[PDB]
Design a protein around this nucleic acid. Structure first.
Ligand SMILES: [Co+2]
Ligand SMILES: [Co+2]
Ligand SMILES: [Co+2]
Ligand SMILES: [Co+2]
Ligand SMILES: [Co+2]
Ligand SMILES: [Co+2]
Ligand SMILES: [Co+2]
Ligand SMILES: [Co+2]
Lengths: 227, 91, 138, 227, 138, 91
DNA sequence: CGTACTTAGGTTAGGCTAACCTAAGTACG
DNA sequence: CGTACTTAGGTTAGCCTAACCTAAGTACG
């Protein structure tokens, strides 16, 4: 269950923008595991309500209102994640799924109280920046042009790099997130990315406590700063 | 089910106490029904009707008549439905 | 608005039992501000799914499963209230409305973490006992 | 399976008009055993295509095109029924269900060939008049103001009457149609309708080979000429 | 247009076998004037429902159930053709297109009545044998 | 399945007969493929290519070459896919 | 004669499969 | 180097339940 269909469509489009993926309805269908017809009908309903527009090349464009609402949901999501990790102490691999429900029920009133409690946090526990803090009534924005995707680093000849962001896409698989934590592919840990040739090949990575394989779509969603 | 049938048998509803001739009692529970109205909950806090505060319930006669209660920081009127939904122990 | 219709009907019936009120469909219509036809149809759907039964005197009786689910929701509600008051510091009057939404999204996993964080609380901030702590393993 | 949704909605509206019932979407939901939302969406699609309009009192009104198409389907239906009974010799109780599928696949070309084969028939084997024969390029129309509904005859004090029409509604239940045939409630047979008081009471009828009970909605759909 | 997609795919595969042609998806695309993607998707759906299998050499093989259904449709088709020519008197060139629609709506009940009416015919008006008369009991 | 593999082994395809050096043969079957074109079926009737009519098939060479056939009421040209789909018994 | 509920006929949101399409690929003698 | 097919992203028609509504009834101390 999505709890709120509209908010999840908005946040999924936001996720795709952060992963540098073209936000198509095909992407929402696979991500939220819904049929093509369902997604088109729901997007048409959101278009009617003025939260997005379907371009000629068919990529989904958030309106002013759509982006505002998407940011609001993502802000609630990553504040929830912060609360769940830092205060409540919920296990690292279970936090996202919990936060993915909580994002739909949290008031701005609570958000403002969480900002104070958590000491004005700027990133989620997975290194993703918290947007729309201006709208709450709360900093210098990190230059994140230096960040490169693990897949692109691997195809460019690999090397050593610091793990900075694990995108929402990766967080959806708890079993994988447990594997990443064990071997030590977590924010603020150094990893060695093995060189591969040709797109859509599984990337080998070596953490502090062993190594593992990432799928092309997973490696694309993990961002690092190469040493 | 302490929540439905209290373990503390001496727990009594505000209206039931008032209709039984008022008295000094310690606020114990404020049911979810009462909580629904914030403006009321602001009032209840302001006059000191909160769990673990001693209050004086004004004796009353006739159902469908509001119940007067005195807290540490003054008094206020409860509705019959509201007073039904507040439990206390008489001292 | 309600987030979960079923859970809110169950908790409303639970509320009425705690208040010593006869849980009729008329009571749910008032409380949740829904039409009589809406409530009857939704209660019929919950009866079909085996969460309650309509008695001869027409008062709503929660089944084993219905009560278990109602307790689960109320437990989440009052643990949320505890967290919101004691830890987050949300204003005393705004907490219930927040907790009324949070009760529908909280996992048992989080409940168990809140039990430890809040030092095994037995009552909400409004003095209402927290039920079904047995079912968490507390 | 309806075979053609549009044609069956049109013919169902036509059926309701012949039964003197107010054609509401609620009636189509019952008859075709479809959900309220399904019927509203399908009717909206037919309204968009200009086959009907939803009035203020919410009764369905066929357009010129809608009525023309409805007649076309009903004509095919009752010509099929004639063919199935008179030529093929399919059992009386099974014919309607067969004809309800055939009505969607028959060309005007075949209709014209069936008209010649069946000797320009004007009524179905259940006494219902065959419309739109003008549109095939084929008679004096029976004055059917003297026809009265078995339910209304029963509430008016009953009496002896000749069975003239069994509507499509009644034909949908083969087991019932077998019961009607046995006791002898068929077109061109005399029956005695027992008097009843109030609406929604089951009407007792006495045929040549015994008697049976009709439900109010069934009795409403059987038309007779009182002696 | 086709009335029943599944039945027409089955009968088209049957047609190709009668013509001694290799039943590929490419053949169905031509015959039914549908896109390659459409045919592959519909054949995959029929494979999933256990009406055929795609071989190694990629020719379509009807299952026991697929063949039984294909025969059923073809039998209805050629009995319809017989009725249309011998009884109704529809023009020789128009009969097939009519029969191609009728094959999808005819019950076995009617088939058995047509067998009696037409005097146990073994071929269509175009000389094609009528299969699956065994399965009617005639 | 007489329909797929004929019981009458002597049944041969018009194109196969033509490529095998023509011959006088009795029209037996006209497959559903042929039937799809009415204009063609009109022509086939007109010239007397129908089941239970003797025809003469003109000997042909090379596939993708149309097959000439002579019926009682004249002759006509078949496409390879059409001629493949017509079965006959050679006299 | 209100209180509780049913009957009757809607509505939108949010899901689904079947069955059609194009445009631009891959695989193979 | 065409023939057969896949990959990718759409579409409309035709179905569903859940969950809300009003207007006008019935049933009962
Ligand atoms: Co997350
Ligand atoms: Co979510
Ligand atoms: Co509360
Ligand atoms: Co709630
Ligand atoms: Co009929
Ligand atoms: Co029909
Ligand atoms: Co044919
Ligand atoms: Co067909």
């Amino acid at each position: 269950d999505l709890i709120d269909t509209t908010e999840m469509y908005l946040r999924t489009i936001y996720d795709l923008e952060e992963e540098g993926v073209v936000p198509l309805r095909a992407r929402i269908a696979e991500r939220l595991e819904q049929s093509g017809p369902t997604v088109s009908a729901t997007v048409a309903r959101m278009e009617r309500d003025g939260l997005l527009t379907v371009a000629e090349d068919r990529h989904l464009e958030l309106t002013k209102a759509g982006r505002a609402r998407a940011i609001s949901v993502m802000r609630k999501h990553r504040l929830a994640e912060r609360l769940l990790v830092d205060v409540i102490g919920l296990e690292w691999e279970q936090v996202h799924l919990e936060a993915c429900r909580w994002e739909h029920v949290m008031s701005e009133a609570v958000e403002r109280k969480l900002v104070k409690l958590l000491g004005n946090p700027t990133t989620s526990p997975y290194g993703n920046p918290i947007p729309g803090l201006d709208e709450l009534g709360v900093s210098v924005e990190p230059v994140d042009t230096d960040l490169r995707r693990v897949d692109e680093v691997a195809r460019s000849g690999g090397g050593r790099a610091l793990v900075c962001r694990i995108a929402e896409h990766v967080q959806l698989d708890p079993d994988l997130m447990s594997e990443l934590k064990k071997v030590g592919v977590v924010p603020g840990n150094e990893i060695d990315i093995v060189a591969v040739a040709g797109v859509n090949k599984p990337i080998q990575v070596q953490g502090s406590e062993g190594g593992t394989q990432l799928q092309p779509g997973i490696a694309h969603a993990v961002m690092v700063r190469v040493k | 089910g302490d929540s439905v049938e209290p373990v503390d048998t001496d727990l009594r509803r505000v209206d039931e106490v008032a209709r039984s001739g008022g008295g000094r009692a310690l606020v114990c529970r404020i049911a979810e029904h009462v909580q629904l109205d914030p403006d009321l909950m602001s009032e209840l806090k302001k006059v000191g009707v909160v769990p673990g505060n001693e209050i004086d319930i004004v004796a009353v006669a006739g159902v469908n008549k509001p119940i007067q209660v005195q807290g540490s920081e003054g008094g206020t009127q409860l509705q019959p439905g509201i007073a039904h939904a507040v439990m206390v122990r008489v001292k | 608005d309600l987030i979960d219709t079923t859970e809110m009907y169950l908790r409303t019936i639970y509320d009425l039992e705690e208040e010593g009120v006869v849980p009729l469909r008329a009571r749910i219509a008032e409380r949740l501000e829904q039409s009589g036809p809406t409530v009857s149809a939704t209660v019929a759907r919950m009866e079909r799914d085996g969460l309650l039964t309509v008695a001869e005197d027409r008062h709503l009786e929660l089944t084993k499963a219905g009560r278990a689910r109602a307790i689960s929701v109320m437990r989440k509600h009052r643990l949320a209230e505890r967290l919101l008051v004691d830890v987050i510091g949300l204003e005393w009057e705004q907490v219930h409305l927040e907790a009324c939404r949070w009760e529908h999204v909280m996992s048992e996993a989080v409940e168990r973490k809140l039990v430890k964080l809040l030092g095994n609380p037995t009552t909400s901030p409004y003095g209402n006992p927290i039920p079904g702590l047995d079912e968490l393993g507390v």
